[PDB]
Amino acid sequence: SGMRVYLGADHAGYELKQRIIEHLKQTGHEPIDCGALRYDADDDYPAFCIAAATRTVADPGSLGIVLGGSGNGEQIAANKVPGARCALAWSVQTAALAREHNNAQLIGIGGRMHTVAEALAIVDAFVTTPWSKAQRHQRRIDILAEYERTHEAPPVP
Amino acid sequence: GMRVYLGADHAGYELKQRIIEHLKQTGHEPIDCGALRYDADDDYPAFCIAAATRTVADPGSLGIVLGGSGNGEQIAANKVPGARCALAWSVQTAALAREHNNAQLIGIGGRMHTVAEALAIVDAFVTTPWSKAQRHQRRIDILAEYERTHEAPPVPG
Numbered sequence: 001s002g003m004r005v006y007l008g009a010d011h012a013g014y015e016l017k018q019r020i021i022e023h024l025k026q027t028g029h030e031p032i033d034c035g036a037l038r039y040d041a042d043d044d045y046p047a048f049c050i051a052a053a054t055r056t057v058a059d060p061g062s063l064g065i066v067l068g069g070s071g072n073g074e075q076i077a078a079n080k081v082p083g084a085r086c087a088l089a090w091s092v093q094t095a096a097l098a099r100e101h102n103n104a105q106l107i108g109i110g111g112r113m114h115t116v117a118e119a120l121a122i123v124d125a126f127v128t129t130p131w132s133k134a135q136r137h138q139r140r141i142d143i144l145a146e147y148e149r150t151h152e153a154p155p156v157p
Numbered sequence: 158g159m160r161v162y163l164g165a166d167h168a169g170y171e172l173k174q175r176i177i178e179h180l181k182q183t184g185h186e187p188i189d190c191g192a193l194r195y196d197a198d199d200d201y202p203a204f205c206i207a208a209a210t211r212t213v214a215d216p217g218s219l220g221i222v223l224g225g226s227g228n229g230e231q232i233a234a235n236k237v238p239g240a241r242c243a244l245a246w247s248v249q250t251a252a253l254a255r256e257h258n259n260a261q262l263i264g265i266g267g268r269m270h271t272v273a274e275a276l277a278i279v280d281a282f283v284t285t286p287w288s289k290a291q292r293h294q295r296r297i298d299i300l301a302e303y304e305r306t307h308e309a310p311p312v313p314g
């Protein structure tokens with residue numbers, strides 16, 4: 001039930017990251033802070049998001065959350081990591097479907113896009129919704145993993 | 158962004174055809190990467206990898222991948238070298254994808270919005286210019302350097 005979660009964030013998602021770490025500790029989960037460890041208005045998101053995604057993939061069973069202003073540059077950075085699948089969660093439904101259909105180990109959230117209560121509801125759905133293991137979803141994940149292996153674009157039907 | 162490459166599976170197929178018609182009416186040249194017909198069991202990765210590959214290989218072009226939530230679609234597009242695919246779920250996030258992230262592509266969930274809401278997201282995506290600001294370009298360069306070497310950049314602190 002209790003999940004390990006690696007969190008990464010730049011200045012725009014820093015304040016929300018600290019609140020999410022506090023929320024995860026209080027709900028039986030194990031947050032691990034990859035940075036940023038303090039507010040720095042000029043810092044760059046890529047390093048924090050690549051660190052969180054890299055450690056998530058290297059620690060199977062763990063999840064991850066990357067935070068920014070919109071969360072989009074953050075999920076893009078995380079998605080460059082081999083083996084990583086980072087959805088952008090902007091609601092309870094998309095957080096749940098990230099796990100259910102895409103088996104996403106990570107999610108990006110925009111700190112400027114939600115209130116604190118809305119963001120924590122997104123996090124709750126992400127860390128409790130199980131991976132469905134449905135055949136068609138695993139088939140799509142296998143195709144994408146094969147493209148990641150060789151970078152040879154598969155033929156279209 | 159004049160030429161716009163669109164990829165989609167069955168869950169985003171009907172919305173993709175509506176976006177192609179809307180783009181023709183607003184002076185753009187949409188190019189259909191597939192699926193060309195509705196197939197309830199087809200897999201998204203191939204259509205999204207094809208749209209992202211062709212967009213990155215075509216200077217000045219943009220791209221849109223569609224699915225149920227558009228999250229597995231942006232994930233697949235982000236595995237393509239050089240590609241930056243945001244998940245656009247609003248006018249604000251579509252505009253910020255261009256302005257901050259220089260995203261050549263966006264994912265959209267056909268099940269998450271009405272037709273009118275989705276077309277407004279598309280309008281913001283194709284009309285909002287890339288800012289070319291120093292800090293945004295710097296972050297895109299750090300990400301592109303990680304794609305080339307797979308050397309995770311050091312975390313500040």
Ligand SMILES: O=C(NO)[C@H](O)[C@H](O)COP(=O)(O)O
Pocket residue numbers: 010011012013041045067068069070071072073074257258292
């Ligand atoms: O939203 C983001 N990336 O998607 C970044 O956090 C955002 O561009 C940072 O912008 P800022 O440097 O104006 O705070």
Ligand SMILES: O=C(NO)[C@H](O)[C@H](O)COP(=O)(O)O
Pocket residue numbers: 101102136166167168169197201223224225226227228229230
């Ligand atoms: O939403 C999606 N990817 O994010 C896919 O289109 C979705 O998982 C496809 O599901 P379906 O095969 O039930 O239509």
